[PDB]
Amino acid sequence: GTQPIDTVGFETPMFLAMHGNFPERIRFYVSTAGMVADGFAVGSPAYQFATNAFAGNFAPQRVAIGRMSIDSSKVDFTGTTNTEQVVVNITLNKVVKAVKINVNTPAQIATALADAVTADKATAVATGTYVTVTAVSPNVVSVGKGAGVYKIVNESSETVATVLPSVIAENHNWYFLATEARSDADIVAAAEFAKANYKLHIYNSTDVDAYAPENSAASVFDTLKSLSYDSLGTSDAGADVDFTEGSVIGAMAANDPSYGDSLHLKTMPGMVPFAGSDTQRSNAWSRNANIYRGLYGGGSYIEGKTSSGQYVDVIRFSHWVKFRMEESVFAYMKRRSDMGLSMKMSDEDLPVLKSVLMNNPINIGIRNGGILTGYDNKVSYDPTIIIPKRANIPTNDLAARILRDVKVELVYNNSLHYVKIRASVVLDRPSTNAQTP
C-alpha cells in the first residue's frame, strides 16, 4: 500500500539515527542549528550527516531525521594511536559540556577518560580500550566527536526491519534512505525495504574486502551483488566516523533527472581520497564499490554504479518520471472534479490524457535533454502514448471503475565517461582514386 511522494519529498533525505532527543519518530530541519537546539551534541552522527548534506553543491533544502531507541553509547580507542589532547563533546539535558584527556597508550587514555564522573545523572564505565556511557531514565545524553582519534558507536534494542515500518507510517514524504547501523543484516534489511518501497538506499562501508582480490570475497557488496538489488554502495575509509552518506547525497539531491546528468566526476566536499593502488581499484570496480579518487589536485567520484551493475542515473530518472506522472494526473483529475465536471469513462474524454501527460512530465525532459528524440535503421525515438477505447475495457474493470493498460515509452540520453586517443609523432609524412563512392 505504498502512498505516493510529491516533489518536495523527492529531495528530502532521511537518516535513521539512534537518540532520544525528541519523542516523535521523525522531524525535519533546515540547518544544523535546529538540531543543536534539540540537544544533538556537536560531532554526533546525525549532526555530521546534516552538515555534510548541507555542505554539498546540490544540497537539499530540508533533512529528515528518524529515531531508533538508544540504549548506551561507546567511546572506543581500541586499535588507535594518540599523541594529542583527546576531547569529547557531551550534551546532558540541554546542558553542554566538554571533556579533556591529555596525551601514553590508548588503554591509559581510556582509563583516564573515566574522569567523566563530575557533574553527573549519567554514568561512565571504562573497560581498558573503550568507555561505555549509559544514561538514567530521565536523563538524555548526546556524545559527539572531538579532536581525538576515536570512533563513537551506539547500540539499541530495536532492529531496522521493525523500526522502518513505523517511520514510513508516521511520514512518507522523503526519497533517500540512510542508516547509522552498519551490520550486514541491517544493511540488507534496509536494501530490501527500500527496493520494495521505491526508495534509493545509500550506504558507506570501510570493509577491506572491497579491496580484497576479485578471485573471491564475502563482503556486503558481494551479498548485494548476488541478490541483485539497486542499493548504491561506496567504500570509504572515514565512513565509520564521518557518515559520508550525507556528502554523497549533497552532490545529487538538487539536480533534477530531466537533464540526464550522471554522477561520474562530481566533487563531494567532506570525502577523503581513495588510497589503495591500481590493482585495488580494479578489484573494487568488480564489486561495484565506487571510490573517490583524488586526481590532478582534486577529488572526483567514479562512475556511480549500483549493486546490480546498472547506473544510478537511469534508476533515478525512472523514479522521477513515475512520481511526476502520478502528481500531474492527480492534479488534473482533482481540478476536473472541483467543478461538477468529473472525468467520465467514455471515448469523448479519454484522449485528453495524452496532452495532460505530455505537458508536465515528458515535455520538460525533452526540453532539457534527458529524453532522446529523432530518427534512427527504421525506428524513431519520439516518446509515445497509447490509450485504450471504451470498447476494449473489460466489464469487470467498468464495474470497478478502473482504467488499465495505459502505456508510455521513452529513450534515455546517457552521458560520456571515458575517452581514448591514438596520438602519433613522426619525422615526416608519406591510392588516388578520386571517384565518388
Partner 1 sequence: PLDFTNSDVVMGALTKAVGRLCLDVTGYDVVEADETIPKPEGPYILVDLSLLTPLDWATNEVVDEDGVVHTAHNYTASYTLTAYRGKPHWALSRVHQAFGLPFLREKYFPTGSPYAYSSTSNIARMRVPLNQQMFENRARTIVTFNATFVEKDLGTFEDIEHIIIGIDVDNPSGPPIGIGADYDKGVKPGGDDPGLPPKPNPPIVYHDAIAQVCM
Partner 2 sequence: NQSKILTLQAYDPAKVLVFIGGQRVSGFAADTKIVITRNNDNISVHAGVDGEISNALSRDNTGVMTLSLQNTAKWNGYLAQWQRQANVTGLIYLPVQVEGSQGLSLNTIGWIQKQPDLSYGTEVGQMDWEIGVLDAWLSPDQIQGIA
Q: Does residue 366 belong to the site contacting partner 2 (CB under 8 A)?
A: yes
Select from partner 1, partner 2, none the partner in contact with residue 366, using the beta carbon and a kind-dependent cut-off of 5 to 8 Å.
partner 2
Q: Does residue 355 belong to the site contacting partner 2 (CB under 8 A)?
A: yes
Q: Does residue 351 belong to the site contacting partner 2 (CB under 8 A)?
A: yes
Q: Does residue 367 belong to the site contacting partner 2 (CB under 8 A)?
A: yes
> CA 434 to CA 437: how far, in whole Å?
9
Q: Residue 151 or residue 316: which is nearer to partner 1 going by CB?
A: 316
> CA 253 to CA 316: how far, in whole Å?
11
Q: Does residue 405 belong to the site contacting partner 2 (CB under 8 A)?
A: no
Output the nine-digit C-alpha cell for 2. 505504498
Query: Least distance in Å: CB of 55 to partner 1?
Result: 20
Output the nine-digit C-alpha cell for 411. 529513450
Q: Does residue 358 belong to the site contacting partner 2 (CB under 8 A)?
A: yes
**90 — phi, psi (to 5°)?**
-135, 135
Q: Residue 47 or residue 311: which is nearer to partner 1 going by CB?
A: 311
Count the alpha carbons within 13 Å of 8 in the hemisphere toward its beta carbon: 7
Q: Residue 186 or residue 261: which is nearer to partner 2 going by CB?
A: 261
Query: Least distance in Å: CB of 401 to partner 2?
Result: 21
Query: Least distance in Å: CB of 355 to partner 2?
Result: 4
Q: Residue 407 or residue 429: which is nearer to partner 1 going by CB?
A: 407
Q: Residue 2 or residue 85: which is nearer to partner 1 going by CB?
A: 2
Select from partner 1, partner 2, none the partner in contact with residue 354, using the beta carbon and a kind-dependent cut-off of 5 to 8 Å.
partner 2
Select from partner 2, partner 1, none the partner in contact with residue 16, using the beta carbon and a kind-dependent cut-off of 5 to 8 Å.
none
Q: Does residue 352 belong to the site contacting partner 2 (CB under 8 A)?
A: yes
- What is the CA 399 to chain-centroid distance, rounded? 42
Point out which residues pair with 396 in neighbouring strands: none
- DSSP letter at 311? B
Query: Least distance in Å: CB of 324 to partner 1?
Result: 9
215: Cβ contacts below 8 Å, ≥ 6 apart: none
Select from partner 1, partner 2, none the partner in contact with residue 38, using the beta carbon and a kind-dependent cut-off of 5 to 8 Å.
none
Output the nine-digit C-alpha cell for 76. 572506543
315: Cβ contacts below 8 Å, ≥ 6 apart: 200, 230, 306
Q: Is 39 helix (H, G, I), strand (E, B) or coil?
A: coil
> The dihedral of CA 19, 22, 25, 27: what is its sign?
negative
Output the nine-digit C-alpha cell for 289. 564499490
Output the nine-digit C-alpha cell for 199. 526508495
Q: Is 117 helix (H, G, I), strand (E, B) or coil?
A: coil
Q: Which stretch binds partner 2 (CB under 8 A): 92-100, 119-127, 198-206, 352-360?
A: 352-360
Q: Does residue 228 belong to the site contacting partner 2 (CB under 8 A)?
A: no
* List 356, 361, 362, 370, residue binding partner 2 (CB under 8 A): 356
Query: Least distance in Å: CB of 62 to partner 1?
Result: 6
- What is the CA 1 to chain-centroid distance, rounded? 23
What residue has cell string 516523535?
A: 24
Select from partner 1, partner 2, none the partner in contact with residue 355, using the beta carbon and a kind-dependent cut-off of 5 to 8 Å.
partner 2
Q: Residue 146 or residue 370: which is nearer to partner 2 going by CB?
A: 370
Q: Residue 227 or residue 406: which is nearer to partner 1 going by CB?
A: 406
98: Cβ contacts below 8 Å, ≥ 6 apart: 87, 88, 89, 90, 146
Pairing of strands 63-68, 141-144: unpaired
Select from partner 2, partner 1, none the partner in contact with residue 330, using the beta carbon and a kind-dependent cut-off of 5 to 8 Å.
partner 1
- Sheet with 151-155, strands from edge to edge, namely 123-126, 130-134, 72-76, 151-155
Q: Which of residues 331-350 bind partner 2 (CB under 8 A)?
A: 332, 335-336, 341, 347-349
Q: Are 50 and 242 in contact (CB under 8 A)?
A: no
Select from partner 1, partner 2, none the partner in contact with residue 429, using the beta carbon and a kind-dependent cut-off of 5 to 8 Å.
none
Select from partner 2, partner 1, none the partner in contact with residue 171, using the beta carbon and a kind-dependent cut-off of 5 to 8 Å.
partner 1
- DSSP letter at 212? S
Q: Does residue 363 belong to the site contacting partner 2 (CB under 8 A)?
A: yes
Query: Least distance in Å: CB of 390 to partner 1?
Result: 7
Q: Residue 148 or residue 260: which is nearer to partner 1 going by CB?
A: 260
- DSSP letter at 333? H
Q: Residue 85 or residue 337: which is nearer to partner 1 going by CB?
A: 337
Point out which residues pair with 68 in neighbouring strands: 18
Binding interface with partner 2 (CB under 8 A):
332, 335-336, 341, 347-349, 351-352, 354-356, 358-359, 363, 366-367
